[PDB]
Tab-separated table of N, CA and C in Angstrom:
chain	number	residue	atom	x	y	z
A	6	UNK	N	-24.028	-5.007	16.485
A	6	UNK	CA	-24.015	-3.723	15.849
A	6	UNK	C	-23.432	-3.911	14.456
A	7	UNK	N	-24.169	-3.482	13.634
A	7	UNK	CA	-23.890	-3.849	11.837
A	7	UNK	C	-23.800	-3.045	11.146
A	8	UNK	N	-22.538	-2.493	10.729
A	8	UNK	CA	-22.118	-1.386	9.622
A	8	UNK	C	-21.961	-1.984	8.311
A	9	UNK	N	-22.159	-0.899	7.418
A	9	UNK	CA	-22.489	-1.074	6.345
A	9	UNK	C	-21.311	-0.336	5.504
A	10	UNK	N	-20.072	-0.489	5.057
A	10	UNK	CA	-19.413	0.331	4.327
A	10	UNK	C	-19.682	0.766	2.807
A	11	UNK	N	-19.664	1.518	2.428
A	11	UNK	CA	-19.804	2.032	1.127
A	11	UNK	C	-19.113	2.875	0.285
A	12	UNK	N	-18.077	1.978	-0.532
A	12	UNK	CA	-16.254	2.258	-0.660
A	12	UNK	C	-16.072	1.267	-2.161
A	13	UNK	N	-15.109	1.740	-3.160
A	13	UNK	CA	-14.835	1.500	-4.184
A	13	UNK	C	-13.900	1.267	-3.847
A	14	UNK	N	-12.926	1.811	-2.693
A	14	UNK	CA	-11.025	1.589	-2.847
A	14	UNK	C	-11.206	0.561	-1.917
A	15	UNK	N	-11.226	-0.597	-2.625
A	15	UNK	CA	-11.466	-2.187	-1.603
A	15	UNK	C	-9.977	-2.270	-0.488
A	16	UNK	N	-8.793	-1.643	-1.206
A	16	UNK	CA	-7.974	-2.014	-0.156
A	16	UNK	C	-8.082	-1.124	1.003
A	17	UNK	N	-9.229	0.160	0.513
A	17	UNK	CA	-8.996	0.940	2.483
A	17	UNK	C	-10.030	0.153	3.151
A	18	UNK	N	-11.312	-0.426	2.045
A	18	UNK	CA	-12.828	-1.250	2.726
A	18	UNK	C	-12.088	-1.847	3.740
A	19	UNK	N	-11.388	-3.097	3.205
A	19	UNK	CA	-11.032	-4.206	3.634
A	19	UNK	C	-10.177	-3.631	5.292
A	20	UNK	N	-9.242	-2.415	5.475
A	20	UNK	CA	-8.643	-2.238	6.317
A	20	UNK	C	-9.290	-1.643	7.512
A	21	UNK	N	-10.513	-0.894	7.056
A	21	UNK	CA	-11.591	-0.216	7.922
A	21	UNK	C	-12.549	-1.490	8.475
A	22	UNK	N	-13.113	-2.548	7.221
A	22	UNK	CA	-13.358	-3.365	8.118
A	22	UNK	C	-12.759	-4.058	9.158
A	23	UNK	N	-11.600	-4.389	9.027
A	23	UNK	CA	-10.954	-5.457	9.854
A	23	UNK	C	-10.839	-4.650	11.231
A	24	UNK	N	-10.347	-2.972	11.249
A	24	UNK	CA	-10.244	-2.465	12.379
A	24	UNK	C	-11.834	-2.778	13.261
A	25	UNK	N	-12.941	-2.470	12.541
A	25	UNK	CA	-14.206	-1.970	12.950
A	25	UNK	C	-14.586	-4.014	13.345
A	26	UNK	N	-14.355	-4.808	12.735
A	26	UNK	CA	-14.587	-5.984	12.858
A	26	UNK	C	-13.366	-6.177	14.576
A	27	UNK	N	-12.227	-5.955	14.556
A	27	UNK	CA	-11.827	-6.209	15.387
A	27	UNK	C	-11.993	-5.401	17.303
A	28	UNK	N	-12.672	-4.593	16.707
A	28	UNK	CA	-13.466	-3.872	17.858
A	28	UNK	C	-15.117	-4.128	18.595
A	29	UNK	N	-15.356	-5.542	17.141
A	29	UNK	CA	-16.617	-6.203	17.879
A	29	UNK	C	-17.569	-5.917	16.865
A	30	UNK	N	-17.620	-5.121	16.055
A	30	UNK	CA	-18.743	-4.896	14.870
A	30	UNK	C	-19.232	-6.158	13.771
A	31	UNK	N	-20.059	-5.941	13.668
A	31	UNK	CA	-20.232	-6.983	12.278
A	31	UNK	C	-20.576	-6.047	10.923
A	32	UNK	N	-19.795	-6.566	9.837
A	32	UNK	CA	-18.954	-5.400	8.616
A	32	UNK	C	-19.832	-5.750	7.511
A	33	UNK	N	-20.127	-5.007	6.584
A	33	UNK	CA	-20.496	-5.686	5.451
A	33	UNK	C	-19.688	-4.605	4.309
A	34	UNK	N	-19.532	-5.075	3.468
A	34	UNK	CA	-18.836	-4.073	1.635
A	34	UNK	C	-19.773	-3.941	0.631
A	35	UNK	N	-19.685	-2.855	0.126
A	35	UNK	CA	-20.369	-3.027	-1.190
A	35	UNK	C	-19.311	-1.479	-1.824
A	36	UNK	N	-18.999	-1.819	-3.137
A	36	UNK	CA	-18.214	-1.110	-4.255
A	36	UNK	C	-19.381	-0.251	-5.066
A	37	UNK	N	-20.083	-0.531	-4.555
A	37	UNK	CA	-21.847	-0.157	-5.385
A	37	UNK	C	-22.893	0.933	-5.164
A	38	UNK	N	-22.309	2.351	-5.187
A	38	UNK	CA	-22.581	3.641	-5.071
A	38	UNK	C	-24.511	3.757	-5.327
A	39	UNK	N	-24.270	3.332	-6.788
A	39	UNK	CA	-25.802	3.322	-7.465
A	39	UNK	C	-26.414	2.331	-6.591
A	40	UNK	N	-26.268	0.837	-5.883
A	40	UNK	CA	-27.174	0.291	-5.468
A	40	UNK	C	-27.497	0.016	-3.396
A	41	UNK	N	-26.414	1.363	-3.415
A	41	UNK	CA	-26.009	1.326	-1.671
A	41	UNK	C	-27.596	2.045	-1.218
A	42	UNK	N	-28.465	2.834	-1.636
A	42	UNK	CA	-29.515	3.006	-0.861
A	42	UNK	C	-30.496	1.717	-0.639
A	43	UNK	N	-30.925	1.518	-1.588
A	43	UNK	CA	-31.776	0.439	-1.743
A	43	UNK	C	-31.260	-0.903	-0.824
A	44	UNK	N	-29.646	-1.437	-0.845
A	44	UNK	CA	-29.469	-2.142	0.132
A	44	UNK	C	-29.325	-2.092	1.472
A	45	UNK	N	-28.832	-0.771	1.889
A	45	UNK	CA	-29.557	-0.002	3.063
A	45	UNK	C	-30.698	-0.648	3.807
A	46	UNK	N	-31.664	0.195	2.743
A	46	UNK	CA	-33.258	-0.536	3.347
A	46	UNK	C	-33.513	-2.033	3.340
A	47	UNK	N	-32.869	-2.620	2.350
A	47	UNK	CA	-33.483	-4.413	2.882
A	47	UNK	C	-32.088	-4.749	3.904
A	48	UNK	N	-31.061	-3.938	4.558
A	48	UNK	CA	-30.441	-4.754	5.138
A	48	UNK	C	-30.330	-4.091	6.759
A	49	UNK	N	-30.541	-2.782	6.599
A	49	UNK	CA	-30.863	-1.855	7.507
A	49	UNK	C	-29.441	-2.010	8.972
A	50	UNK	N	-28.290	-1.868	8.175
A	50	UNK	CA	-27.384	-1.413	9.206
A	50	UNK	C	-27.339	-0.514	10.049
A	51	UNK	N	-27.242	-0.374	11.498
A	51	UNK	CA	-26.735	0.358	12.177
A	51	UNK	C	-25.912	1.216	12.184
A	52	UNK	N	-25.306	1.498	11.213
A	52	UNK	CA	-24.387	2.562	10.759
A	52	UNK	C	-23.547	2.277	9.511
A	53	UNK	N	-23.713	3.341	8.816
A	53	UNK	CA	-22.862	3.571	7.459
A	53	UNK	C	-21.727	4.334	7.353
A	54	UNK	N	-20.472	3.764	7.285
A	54	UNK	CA	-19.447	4.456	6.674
A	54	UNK	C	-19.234	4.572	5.075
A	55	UNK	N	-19.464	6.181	4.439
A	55	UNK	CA	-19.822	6.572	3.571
A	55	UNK	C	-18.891	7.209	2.468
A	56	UNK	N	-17.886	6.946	1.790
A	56	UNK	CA	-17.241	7.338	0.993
A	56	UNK	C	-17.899	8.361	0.106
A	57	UNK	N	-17.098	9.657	-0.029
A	57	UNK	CA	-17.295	10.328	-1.155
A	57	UNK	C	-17.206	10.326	-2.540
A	58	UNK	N	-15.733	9.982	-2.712
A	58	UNK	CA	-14.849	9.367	-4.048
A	58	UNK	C	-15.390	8.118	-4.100
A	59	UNK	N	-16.576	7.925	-4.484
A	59	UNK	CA	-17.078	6.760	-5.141
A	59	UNK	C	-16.891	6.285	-6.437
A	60	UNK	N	-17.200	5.117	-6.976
A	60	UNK	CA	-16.774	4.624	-8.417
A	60	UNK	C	-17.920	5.746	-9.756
A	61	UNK	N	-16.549	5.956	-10.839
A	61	UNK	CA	-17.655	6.146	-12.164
A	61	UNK	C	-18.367	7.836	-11.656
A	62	UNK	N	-17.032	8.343	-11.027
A	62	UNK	CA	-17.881	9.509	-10.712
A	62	UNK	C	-18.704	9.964	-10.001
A	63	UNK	N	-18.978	9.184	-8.835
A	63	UNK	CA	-20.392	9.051	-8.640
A	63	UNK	C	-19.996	10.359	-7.068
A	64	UNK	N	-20.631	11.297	-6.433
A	64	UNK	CA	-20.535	12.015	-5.138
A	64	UNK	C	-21.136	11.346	-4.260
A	65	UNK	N	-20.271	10.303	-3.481
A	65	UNK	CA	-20.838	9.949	-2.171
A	65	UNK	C	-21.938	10.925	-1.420
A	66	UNK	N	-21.525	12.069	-1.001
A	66	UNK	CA	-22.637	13.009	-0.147
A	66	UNK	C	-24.387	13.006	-0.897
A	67	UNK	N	-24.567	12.592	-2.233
A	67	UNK	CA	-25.712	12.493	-3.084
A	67	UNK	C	-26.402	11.432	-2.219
A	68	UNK	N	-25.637	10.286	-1.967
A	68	UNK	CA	-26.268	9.374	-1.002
A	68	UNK	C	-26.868	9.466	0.031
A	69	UNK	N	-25.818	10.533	0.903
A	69	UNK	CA	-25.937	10.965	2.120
A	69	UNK	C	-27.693	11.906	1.813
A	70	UNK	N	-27.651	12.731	0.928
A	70	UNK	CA	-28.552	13.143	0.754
A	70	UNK	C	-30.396	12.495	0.359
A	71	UNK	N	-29.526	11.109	-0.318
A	71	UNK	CA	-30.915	10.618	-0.121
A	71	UNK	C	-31.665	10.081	0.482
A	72	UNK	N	-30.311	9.444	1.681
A	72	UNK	CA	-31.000	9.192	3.084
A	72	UNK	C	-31.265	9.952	3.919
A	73	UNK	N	-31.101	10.787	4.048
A	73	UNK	CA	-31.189	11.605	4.929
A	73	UNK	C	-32.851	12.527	4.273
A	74	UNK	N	-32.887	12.066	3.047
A	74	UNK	CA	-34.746	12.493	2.577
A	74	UNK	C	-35.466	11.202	2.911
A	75	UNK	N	-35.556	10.417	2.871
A	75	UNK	CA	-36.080	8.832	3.057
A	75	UNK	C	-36.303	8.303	4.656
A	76	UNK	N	-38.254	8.030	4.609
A	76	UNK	CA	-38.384	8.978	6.037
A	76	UNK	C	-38.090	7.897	6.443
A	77	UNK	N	-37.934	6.621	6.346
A	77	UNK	CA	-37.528	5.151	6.683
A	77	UNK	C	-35.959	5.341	7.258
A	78	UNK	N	-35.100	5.705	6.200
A	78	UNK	CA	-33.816	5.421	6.408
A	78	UNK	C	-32.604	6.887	6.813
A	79	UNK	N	-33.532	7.948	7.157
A	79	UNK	CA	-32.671	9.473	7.695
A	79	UNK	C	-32.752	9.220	8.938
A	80	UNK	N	-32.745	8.182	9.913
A	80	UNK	CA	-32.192	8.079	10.713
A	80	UNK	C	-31.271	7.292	11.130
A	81	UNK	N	-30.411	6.548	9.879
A	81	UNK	CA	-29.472	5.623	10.254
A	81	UNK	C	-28.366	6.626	10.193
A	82	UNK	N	-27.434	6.637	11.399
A	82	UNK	CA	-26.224	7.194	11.344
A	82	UNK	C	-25.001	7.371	10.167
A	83	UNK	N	-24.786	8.277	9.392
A	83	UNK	CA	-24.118	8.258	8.136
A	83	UNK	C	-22.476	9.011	8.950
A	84	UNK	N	-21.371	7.681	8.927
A	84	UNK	CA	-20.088	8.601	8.895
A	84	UNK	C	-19.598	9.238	7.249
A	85	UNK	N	-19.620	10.162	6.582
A	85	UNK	CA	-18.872	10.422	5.570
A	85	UNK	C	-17.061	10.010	5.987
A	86	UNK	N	-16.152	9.771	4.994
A	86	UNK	CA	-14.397	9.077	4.625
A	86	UNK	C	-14.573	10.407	3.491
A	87	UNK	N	-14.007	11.053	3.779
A	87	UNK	CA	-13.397	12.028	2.027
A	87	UNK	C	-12.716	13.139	2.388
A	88	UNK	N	-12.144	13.782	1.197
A	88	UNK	CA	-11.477	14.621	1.314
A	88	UNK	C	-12.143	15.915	2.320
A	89	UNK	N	-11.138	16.364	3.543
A	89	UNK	CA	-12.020	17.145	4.526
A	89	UNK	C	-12.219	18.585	3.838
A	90	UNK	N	-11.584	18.944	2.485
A	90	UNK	CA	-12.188	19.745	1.755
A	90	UNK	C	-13.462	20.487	1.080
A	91	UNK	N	-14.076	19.091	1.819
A	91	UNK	CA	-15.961	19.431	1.635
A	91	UNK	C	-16.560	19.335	2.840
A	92	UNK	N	-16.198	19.088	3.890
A	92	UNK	CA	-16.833	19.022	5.049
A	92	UNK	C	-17.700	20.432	5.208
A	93	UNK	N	-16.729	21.400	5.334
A	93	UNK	CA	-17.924	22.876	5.806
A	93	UNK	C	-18.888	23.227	4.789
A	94	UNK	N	-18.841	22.837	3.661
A	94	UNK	CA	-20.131	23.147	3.034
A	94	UNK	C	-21.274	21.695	3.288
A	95	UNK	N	-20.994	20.399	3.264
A	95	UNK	CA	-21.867	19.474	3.683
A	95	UNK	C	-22.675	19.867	5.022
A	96	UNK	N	-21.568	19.872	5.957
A	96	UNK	CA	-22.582	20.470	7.496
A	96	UNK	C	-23.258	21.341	7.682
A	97	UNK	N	-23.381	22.330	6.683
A	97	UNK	CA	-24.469	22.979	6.534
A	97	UNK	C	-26.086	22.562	6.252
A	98	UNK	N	-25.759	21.134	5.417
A	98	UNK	CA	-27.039	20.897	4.473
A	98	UNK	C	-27.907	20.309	6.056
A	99	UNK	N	-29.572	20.470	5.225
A	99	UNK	CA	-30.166	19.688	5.870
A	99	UNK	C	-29.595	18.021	5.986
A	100	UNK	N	-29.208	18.014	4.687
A	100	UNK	CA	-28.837	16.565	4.960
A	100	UNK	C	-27.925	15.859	5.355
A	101	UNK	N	-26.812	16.949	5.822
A	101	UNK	CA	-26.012	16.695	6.617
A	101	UNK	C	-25.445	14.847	7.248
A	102	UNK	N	-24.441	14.694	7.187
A	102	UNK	CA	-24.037	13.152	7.711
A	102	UNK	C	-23.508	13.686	9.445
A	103	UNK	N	-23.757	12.217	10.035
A	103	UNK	CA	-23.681	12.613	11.362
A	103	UNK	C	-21.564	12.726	11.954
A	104	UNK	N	-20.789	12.491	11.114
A	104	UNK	CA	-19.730	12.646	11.234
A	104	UNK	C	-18.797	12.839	10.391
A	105	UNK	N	-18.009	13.206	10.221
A	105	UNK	CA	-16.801	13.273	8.871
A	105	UNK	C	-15.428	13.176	9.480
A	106	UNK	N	-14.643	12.341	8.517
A	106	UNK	CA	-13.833	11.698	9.117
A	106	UNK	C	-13.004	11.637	7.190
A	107	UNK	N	-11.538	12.838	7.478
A	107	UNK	CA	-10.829	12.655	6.456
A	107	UNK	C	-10.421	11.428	6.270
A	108	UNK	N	-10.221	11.479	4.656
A	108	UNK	CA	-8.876	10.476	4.031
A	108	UNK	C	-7.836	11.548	4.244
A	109	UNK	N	-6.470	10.971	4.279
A	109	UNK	CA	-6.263	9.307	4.956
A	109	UNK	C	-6.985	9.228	6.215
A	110	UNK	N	-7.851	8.023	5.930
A	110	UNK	CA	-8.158	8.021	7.171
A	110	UNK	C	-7.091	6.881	8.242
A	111	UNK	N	-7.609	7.681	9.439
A	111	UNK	CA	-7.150	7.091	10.662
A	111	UNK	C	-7.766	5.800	10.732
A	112	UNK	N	-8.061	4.797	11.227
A	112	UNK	CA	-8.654	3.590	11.076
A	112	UNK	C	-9.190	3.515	12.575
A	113	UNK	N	-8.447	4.066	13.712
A	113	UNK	CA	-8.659	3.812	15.103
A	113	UNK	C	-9.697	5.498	14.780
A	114	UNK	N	-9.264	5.822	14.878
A	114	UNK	CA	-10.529	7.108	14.867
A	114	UNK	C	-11.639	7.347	14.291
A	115	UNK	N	-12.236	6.270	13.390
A	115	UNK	CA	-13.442	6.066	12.548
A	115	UNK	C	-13.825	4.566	13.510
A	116	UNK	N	-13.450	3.747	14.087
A	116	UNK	CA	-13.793	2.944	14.851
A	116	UNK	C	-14.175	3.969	16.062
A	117	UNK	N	-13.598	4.905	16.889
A	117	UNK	CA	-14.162	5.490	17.783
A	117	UNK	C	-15.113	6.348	17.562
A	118	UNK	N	-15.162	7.244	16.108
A	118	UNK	CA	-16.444	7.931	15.932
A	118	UNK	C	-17.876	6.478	15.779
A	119	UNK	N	-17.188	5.474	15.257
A	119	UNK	CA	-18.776	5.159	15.295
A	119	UNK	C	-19.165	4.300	16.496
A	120	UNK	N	-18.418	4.282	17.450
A	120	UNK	CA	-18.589	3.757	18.802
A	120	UNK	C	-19.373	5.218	19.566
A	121	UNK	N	-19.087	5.913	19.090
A	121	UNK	CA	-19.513	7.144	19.738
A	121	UNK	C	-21.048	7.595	19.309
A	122	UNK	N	-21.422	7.336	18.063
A	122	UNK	CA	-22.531	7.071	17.358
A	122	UNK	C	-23.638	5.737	17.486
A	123	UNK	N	-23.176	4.675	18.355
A	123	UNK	CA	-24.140	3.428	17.882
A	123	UNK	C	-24.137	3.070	19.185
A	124	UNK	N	-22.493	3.443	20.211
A	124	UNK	CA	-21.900	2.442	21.099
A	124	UNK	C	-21.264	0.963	20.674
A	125	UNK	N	-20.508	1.276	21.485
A	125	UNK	CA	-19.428	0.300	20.886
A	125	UNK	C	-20.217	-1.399	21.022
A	126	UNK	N	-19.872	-2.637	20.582
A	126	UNK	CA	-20.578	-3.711	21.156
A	126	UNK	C	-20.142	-4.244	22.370
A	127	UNK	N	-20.961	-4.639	22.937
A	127	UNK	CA	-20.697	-5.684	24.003
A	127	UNK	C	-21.445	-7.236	24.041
């Protein structure tokens, strides 16, 4: 099972991976807002943990939105990480992400939402 994080603050990447790595996942990083769809599709993870507060300004949920149009890739499971200050207007959208999960985040509780989303590995 292969998540895909998509995170500028390398020191929470690095801590979300290691939890999600130590629960059996295989992790990948990218700091790279502008080039996270496109690697998506040639790498096609099993689930994305999705930062909002992305680099250079950028609105994580824009992402969320373009997968979730992209008839290839709106069905890979999107957790949104951000301030839970935007959650009730996101869950409204069609494009909606399949979980949200504040900063700070919990590290054991974003490992269980996406066990809950993919199943955990065995």
């Amino acid at each position: 099972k292969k998540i895909l994080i998509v995170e500028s603050d390398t020191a929470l990447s690095a801590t979300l991976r290691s939890a999600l790595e130590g629960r059996g996942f295989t992790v990948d990083e990218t700091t790279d807002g502008k080039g996270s769809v496109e690697q998506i599709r040639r790498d096609r993870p099993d689930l994305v943990v999705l930062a909002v507060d992305l680099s250079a300004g950028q609105n994580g949920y824009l992402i969320c939105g373009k997968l979730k149009k992209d008839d290839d890739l709106k069905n890979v499971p999107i957790v949104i990480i951000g301030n839970p200050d935007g959650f009730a207007q996101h869950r409204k959208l069609k494009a909606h992400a399949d979980e949200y999960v504040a900063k700070p985040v919990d590290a054991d509780q974003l490992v269980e939402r996406a066990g809950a989303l993919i199943g955990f590995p065995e």
